[PDB]
Amino acid sequence: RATFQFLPDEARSLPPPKLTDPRLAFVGFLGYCSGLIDNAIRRRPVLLAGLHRQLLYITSFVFVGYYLLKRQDYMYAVRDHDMFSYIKSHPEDFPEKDKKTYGEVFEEFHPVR
Amino acid sequence: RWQEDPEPEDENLYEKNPDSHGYDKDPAVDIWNMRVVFFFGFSIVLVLGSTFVAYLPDYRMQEWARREAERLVKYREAHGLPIMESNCFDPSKIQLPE
Amino acid sequence: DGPEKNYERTMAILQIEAEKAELRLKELEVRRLMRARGDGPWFHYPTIDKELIDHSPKATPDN
Amino acid sequence: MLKYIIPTIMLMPLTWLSKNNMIWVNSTAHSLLISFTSLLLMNQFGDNSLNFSLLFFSDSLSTPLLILTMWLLPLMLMASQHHLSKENLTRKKLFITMLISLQLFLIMTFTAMELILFYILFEATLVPTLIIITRWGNQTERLNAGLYFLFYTLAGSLPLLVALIYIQNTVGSLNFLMLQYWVQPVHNSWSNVFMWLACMMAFMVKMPLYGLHLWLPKAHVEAPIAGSMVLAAVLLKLGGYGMLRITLILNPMTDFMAYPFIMLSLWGMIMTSSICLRQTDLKSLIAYSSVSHMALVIVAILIQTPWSYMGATALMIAHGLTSSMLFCLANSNYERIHSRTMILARGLQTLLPLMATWWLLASLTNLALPPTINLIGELFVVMSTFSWSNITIILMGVNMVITALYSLYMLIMTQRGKYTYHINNISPSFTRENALMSLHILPLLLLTLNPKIILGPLY
Amino acid sequence: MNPIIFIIILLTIMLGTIIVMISSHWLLVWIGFEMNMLAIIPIMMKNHNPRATEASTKYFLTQSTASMLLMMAVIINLMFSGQWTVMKLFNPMASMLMTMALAMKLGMAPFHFWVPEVTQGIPLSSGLILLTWQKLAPMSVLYQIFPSINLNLILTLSVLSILIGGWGGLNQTQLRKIMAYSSIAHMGWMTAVLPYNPTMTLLNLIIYIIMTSTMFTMFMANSTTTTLSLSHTWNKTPIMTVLILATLLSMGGLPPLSGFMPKWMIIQEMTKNNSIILPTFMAITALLNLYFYMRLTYSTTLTMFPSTNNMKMKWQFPLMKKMTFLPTMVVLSTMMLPLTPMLSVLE
Amino acid sequence: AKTVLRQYWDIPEGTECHRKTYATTSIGGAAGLVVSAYSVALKTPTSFLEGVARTGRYTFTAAAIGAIFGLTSCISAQVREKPDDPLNYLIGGCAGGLILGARTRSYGIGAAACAYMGLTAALVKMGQLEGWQVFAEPKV
Amino acid sequence: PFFDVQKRLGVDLDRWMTIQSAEQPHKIPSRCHAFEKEWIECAHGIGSIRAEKECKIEFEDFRECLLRQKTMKRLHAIRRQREKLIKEGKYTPPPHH
């Protein structure tokens, strides 16, 4: 909500992404793939070379990805909060219907002959 | 034209290895490849898998349906009811239009 | 898996998919109304901020 | 489905971390073990499908297709390892990776519970298939074949994407379980005529439908043997599987929208069976055989009866094992004489006796000899089409006559007669080649003993 | 150019773009464009040859013309509203002029003729800036004025851009011209969805910039600017041919690659507004982009073109180019589809 | 274009065919002039006369296609007594495509134009009947 | 602004010159100050979609002040009627005109 803010303060009333979040694991896997591609384009032993460099690729991807997921989760909470508050404010636009059973509702039968 | 290698000659695996199984040039790898294909393909998947399929527990409950139908036929004929009614759903629960 | 577990797992799956489907329909109708009437948080296009106005007495009176 | 997705992924590290001389041994051994565990999918119920999670489910339609898919990966590896022997080691590993990645997209495609997830995986199979054809095909025409394969599919897939998203907007869900209960009839309108077409044209191109089939003779011929095995056995069945699912939401409009496509199929099969009689290329002949058989699947799906859906499901499985076996049989000849011309090498039964037995068994299953599951499927489709209209027995009957002629013509021309004098490098059949043939035919003939597991959800 | 001078000029290119993006006043927006135009011309002329002179001259004439139209729109807006706030314009003639001016700066069809020529005439490093960073300022302005944009005008520009971008790329053998016509086509998708959901415009812009940067960086690594010189890459850096293949497939919008995500989301937002004909037409027309992307993959990765004897001398030296961020960019260019719901961060 | 387009759709099918041909011919002529203006501007004619010759050749060709279409589709509706059928636009569309092949002297362009002009025109009538939107207004 | 760093940082880079009713040197008012103030306060906070209809009266008055289009239309009529009457001799201006 707050102008030009990545994580408005109201977002702290939401639970943070777990560090075992499957999306965070995928992001970390992307960091690992980036490390391997880095070795490959420089003709270094792909798996073994420069493990410190590979570690930083994983850690930096996870670090940024954690805050993106935190903001992603927040923005969908805001979408739900806005939509339900609007439904409360305009009941006549969202009437609760009378539900009829299939014994009462007429549906045409189309034979497959 | 250009500088290009000529097409290499054809290699018959039987000249070097008369006992070739056709998997690998290396006779030891060639034997192992045949072993895994036959053991895992024929001995495991086809033999055990066929046994598994044969003893599937009532696949799609066709055997329960036959047992259930016998129970219904016995009950309905004893009590004088029709074996099967044209109506699937009780018409007291239906409200026709018009 | 026994039929009961699969059967009741299916009802759990059906409930979530039915709840999501209803929300998707609600979102499309909420978006339609908010855009047409401008009365909601979405499609709130900015107007000039009124804190920019200066209300001090001016060089001349009629303003 | 994670018990199949994860181990299928683990095939990739296995192949890349193997010793340079064990990549085929290791991948083949472990893809067979995955194939074994796929039999656990046959825990099917009479009323309810097997619904694992919000993402994946299995029913009697997807289960046999999944089992066929995971069984084919081991067979594609054995078929490939001879003609890739001279290939660079890292390029060999990449080739195996494409096959593994293709399997991964297939097993998820057949089990995705949401249609848009199905669409993405349905489309993701293009990439590995295209790479396999264009990178590892032998001829100049493989480049053109890839383009036809890519754009014929995409020209139909892109309208499908719009249609699916439109269906989700209006219905609120694309989950297939939800669509079973929230489905509404489709009333006549020009708007719905094109919704119907956009929902069916992508699947018709994949089958392929007669008229839209030109990509297949090119692609199925230019591909390496493994590419042809998967293209014929499985990828063609994405079209049939897709139609079987989406026709749920197209009623009753399918009543009259099916007519142009039933006509293309009924007449198409007679046209594509007749083509096979005058084909000079053995692989091309087999490819045109697939069009003829898949025409029955299209008709069976469109007329939409309990018998035709059982027949369609049986035909898709039976064709997969047969067509794959025939490509492998023709490849074994090609790996000896380096030509696809059918009349080049003749009288081969004299020089390769056992391999001539496989040719016979493959030919008999192709012409639908009872009680093979090829006949079971083809007969069930004919039974239901006769009810749809009695006159269709004339076209089905004629196709059965023509199919026997070209099935035995291929057997007679290549295996019987006199051997070609100047062809003197017909080495005896390898164990690998004999085993590869028997791994198609034996499961195919065993299924006759228990055909209910390949008859689909309406059994 | 002195290294310090080059850095100062690059920071002025960024400052001009940033001024446009933080300004609430039309005059400062116009200043930002002018400052940006000022600092990019020396980057185009940095190699001093007749083709770079022609490229810079054509760029200056087009950009300076568009700035006049932009300033005209601002002054008309001032006359009919008495204020300068960056937002919707208060005069339809002011909206037409500003929209045409921004389309000119973006090189959208039918104002597109300069993009293929200017990109071809400047180095790869300068073309990378021209086709990525330079789209940010005009897009950020459209993002704010779209409520007052004429729907028929913007969708006409979008459709013509997709057609002309797709058709134009079919006839190209030069890599820079291929990227230029690709950029024209991708601009069409960005502005087609603008009237419906500007958030999807930003996603398309961000994903396009990543993929475009990835391609230009790989071309720079091998110092390749033609199709044929790029066809030697398999006989030098095989890994690079695979990265090029994956990115080109991604740029074509094929699942399961990242480049399919913007097309997917743009079709969704358009169908929600009962726009069916246009997204179908756009997706089918985009197959032209895929066609000439595929040709590149054929000559680069999926076949082995003839090489030269002197190439053997290259085997004995390692790649020395910086290739900054390339490992990250290529992964993001190809492997983002499972994270599509992350687009809400752009709301 | 907005006014010339309304005129066409505001006069019912089969009623006042001559008026219909005026509107479609007017549309076709405008399209031909636009094509001429871009062509003459981007491929300079060798002489002023040759520029006029090229313009009159494109504008007439485009007006002829518009004339034959608007007439034939109206005649079909009148004769068939079915003013709401897309098939009339298909016949009109194909006839225009045929005239394009005539003015170009090329049966192949005539055949292809008849198919795609015919289908495109038929799609236009369907969208009019069903309310399909090309430049759909933003609503959500 | 696309990025509202001005609001976050609390620095006024250019919004001091966005409207004619903001603070001016030595409190010199613009000619249409009151009209701009009235329109700006009417539309504040409610958004353009609502403001385009609920503040139409204020915007029309502000537009009339800015360009005076309706005032010159009125003066044109009076001046045309006068020049017509004079030549017909019907009207004589008062001594102070």
Ligand SMILES: CCCCCCCCCCCCCCCCCC(=O)OC[C@H](COP(=O)(O)OCCN)OC(=O)CCCCCCCCCCCCCCCCC
């Ligand atoms: C549990 C993990 C499951 C795997 C998931 C894979 C998902 C796709 C990830 C793509 C990124 C792959 C990593 C980047 C490539 C680096 C590897 C390479 O370029 O060359 C192979 C290299 C061995 O060659 P060398 O250069 O000599 O180095 C010696 C090191 N021992 O390095 C090696 O020794 C092997 C390294 C792995 C080889 C990767 C091959 C690329 C696969 C691309 C196919 C597309 C992925 C499948 C599609 C479905 C995605 C789930």
Ligand SMILES: CCCCCCCCCCCCCCCCCC(=O)OC[C@H](COP(=O)(O)OCCN)OC(=O)CCCCCCCCCCCCCCCCC
């Ligand atoms: C959207 C969901 C997915 C999330 C996407 C997130 C994308 C953004 C996340 C960041 C991505 C970039 C991560 C780069 C990791 C590799 C960095 C590295 O290994 O550098 C090693 C070394 C330099 O390390 P050094 O700079 O000295 O560390 C001290 C910093 N003060 O020197 C080297 O040899 C490195 C050479 C390879 C680097 C390529 C060129 C880039 C230069 C990077 C400089 C250092 C980057 C530090 C990253 C920190 C980011 C938090």
Ligand SMILES: CCCCCCCCCCCCCCCCCC(=O)OC[C@H](COP(=O)(O)OCCN)OC(=O)CCCCCCCCCCCCCCCCC
């Ligand atoms: C994860 C979920 C999201 C899903 C999206 C898809 C994920 C995959 C995204 C791919 C991104 C690119 C990263 C791929 C890594 C490629 C690894 C590789 O190419 O192996 C390295 C090798 C380089 O060779 P070299 O360094 O010289 O080592 C000695 C061997 N000659 O390479 C070579 O030697 C090859 C040279 C011959 C060229 C063969 C080309 C055909 C094989 C292409 C396979 C990769 C295709 C990737 C496209 C996507 C596939 C779905």
Ligand SMILES: CCCCCCCCCCCCO[C@@H]1O[C@H](CO)[C@@H](O[C@H]2O[C@H](CO)[C@@H](O)[C@H](O)[C@H]2O)[C@H](O)[C@H]1O
């Ligand atoms: C391989 C391609 C296969 C192509 C298959 C072609 C199938 C053609 C199906 C035609 C039927 C379409 O469905 C038909 O649409 C029109 C829409 O105008 C509906 O009719 C509606 O418009 C027409 C105007 O033409 C009015 O007559 C009618 O009063 C109105 O309700 C019909 O109620 C419906 O029956």
Ligand SMILES: CCCCCCCCCCCCO[C@@H]1O[C@H](CO)[C@@H](O[C@H]2O[C@H](CO)[C@@H](O)[C@H](O)[C@H]2O)[C@H](O)[C@H]1O
């Ligand atoms: C490529 C091969 C081409 C071969 C030629 C194939 C021609 C196929 C024409 C498609 C079908 C067109 O004809 C179609 O007939 C069915 C009836 O069966 C009609 O169906 C509709 O009308 C009937 C009555 O007419 C009603 O019961 C109902 O409203 C609906 O079923 C369609 O409105 C009509 O569009």
Ligand SMILES: CCCCCCCCCCCCO[C@@H]1O[C@H](CO)[C@@H](O[C@H]2O[C@H](CO)[C@@H](O)[C@H](O)[C@H]2O)[C@H](O)[C@H]1O
């Ligand atoms: C409802 C209204 C329907 C409006 C229909 C509008 C139809 C579209 C007309 C577009 C303008 C005509 O388009 C133009 O036609 C002429 C035909 O003379 C073609 O011109 C080509 O054919 C002939 C002879 O070959 C000559 O004109 C010329 O030598 C050649 O270039 C152009 O290649 C084409 O660009």
Ligand SMILES: CCCCCCCCCCCCO[C@@H]1O[C@H](CO)[C@@H](O[C@H]2O[C@H](CO)[C@@H](O)[C@H](O)[C@H]2O)[C@H](O)[C@H]1O
């Ligand atoms: C090569 C293929 C290229 C792409 C082809 C795309 C085909 C698109 C077909 C046109 C879409 C519909 O086109 C348009 O529909 C609307 C209705 O919504 C009609 O709109 C009309 O409706 C009313 C009455 O119905 C008319 O009085 C009025 O003049 C007009 O508003 C238009 O007269 C028609 O031109």
Ligand SMILES: N=C(N)NC(=N)NCCc1ccc(I)c(Cl)c1
């Ligand atoms: N369609 C538009 N132009 N606006 C728009 N994004 N409407 C949708 C509303 C929305 C969507 C996601 C989030 I997260 C939030 Cl908070 C609000």
